């Protein structure tokens, strides 16, 4: 219902706020092959973390969609939810893109530094 959607959302946003912060405080790509390997490894682990939380993110977005389409909510409640989902989707997609670009650069670095 609305209550269980709000609780799922809070949990997802708490996780995501820390995932964004963790991603932001990664060191810039090193020139040493052994350091780039550790950074490649750390980022691969983070990419699986992101992966594992995808279904919780989809769940909250699905729950919010159902609640809005079912027509049982107040105009204010539908306002709040639309705003919540909009913001969540924006941040989730932004983190997806950024982390994928990070992975590409680390991948290209590791290969170049090994050849
Ligand atoms: Mg209404």
Numbering used by the authors: 310 to 424
Quote the study that presented this structure, word for word.
Dystrophin is a large (427 kD) multidomain protein expressed in skeletal and cardiac muscle where it binds to the dystrophin-associated glycoprotein (DAG) complex of the plasma membrane and to F-actin connecting the cytoskeleton to the membrane. Dys and Utr potentially act as cellular biomechanical shock-absorbers limiting damage to the plasma membrane with the spectrin repeat domains acting as spring units by undergoing force-induced unfolding. Dys and Utr-SR1 adopt the canonical spectrin repeat fold comprising a triple helical bundle displaying an approximately cylindrical structure of overall dimensions ∼60 Å length and ∼9 Å radius (between backbone atoms).
The Utr N-terminal spectrin repeat 1 (Utr-SR1) crystallised with two molecules in the asymmetric unit of the P212121 cell and has been refined to a final model with crystallographic R and Rfree values of 0.200 and 0.235 with diffraction data of outer limit 1.95 Å resolution. Helix A (Utr 310–334; Dys 340–364, residue number is offset by +30 for Dys-SR1 relative to Utr-SR1) is shorter than B (Utr 342–379; Dys 372–409) and C (Utr 384–423; Dys 414–453) with the triple helix structure changing to coiled-coil formed between the B and C helices after the C-terminal end of helix A, a conserved feature for spectrin repeats domains. Helices A and C are straight but helix B has an appreciable bend in the centre with the loss of canonical main chain n+4 helical hydrogen bonding for residues Utr 360–361.This bending of helix B, a conserved spectrin repeat domain structural motif, is stabilised by conserved side chain stacking interactions between H362 and W324 (helix A) in combination with W401 (helix C) augmenting the hydrophobic heptad repeat central domain core. Curiously the Utr-SR1 (and Utr-SR1-L) structures are the first single spectrin repeat structures determined by x-ray crystallography in the Protein Data Bank; the single drosophila α-spectrin repeat 14 structure has been determined but crystallizes in a domain-swapped dimer conformation rather than the isolated three-helix bundle fold and Dys-SR1 is disulphide linked.
